[PDB]
Design a protein around this ligand. Sequence first.
Ligand SMILES: [Cl-]
Ligand SMILES: [Cl-]
Length: 162
Amino acid sequence: MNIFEMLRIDEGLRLKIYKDTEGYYTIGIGHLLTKSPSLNAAKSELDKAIGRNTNGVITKDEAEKLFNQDVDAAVRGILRNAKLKPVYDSLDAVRRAALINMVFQMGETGVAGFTNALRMLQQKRWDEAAVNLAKSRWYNQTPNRAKRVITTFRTGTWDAYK
Ligand SMILES: [Cl-]
Ligand SMILES: [Cl-]
């Protein structure tokens, strides 16, 4: 198992503009297009991201190309964030995947805000951080996905995904 596969399981793949769990226009593998309520706006962003007139539909390769940029971007965001970097550096390969997943989903700012759990992750207090991670909107809105990530942090294995 690896980061790409993990995230592909969590976000799925759609070749046509869709709405996310929050009602936002998305496409491909969890690629947020816009938070605007307008499909046109979504469409224009899409065209701009792909570089062609797409009319709301992309190919598999295109979805994969956006996905590679997005994963790369998330990793770099972690590496550049003063609060995230230390955390990522202190972790094993599997747990690094767990933090990258959260960043892909909720952004750097989002994750950076889990102050306490972050500190707990740094101290390698697995059980405690996991409990803290569950007291959040994130866990309450996407409980199945949050459980998977949270188990990954607790255990350090890919079991929740196997
Ligand atoms: Cl983009
Ligand atoms: Cl879920």
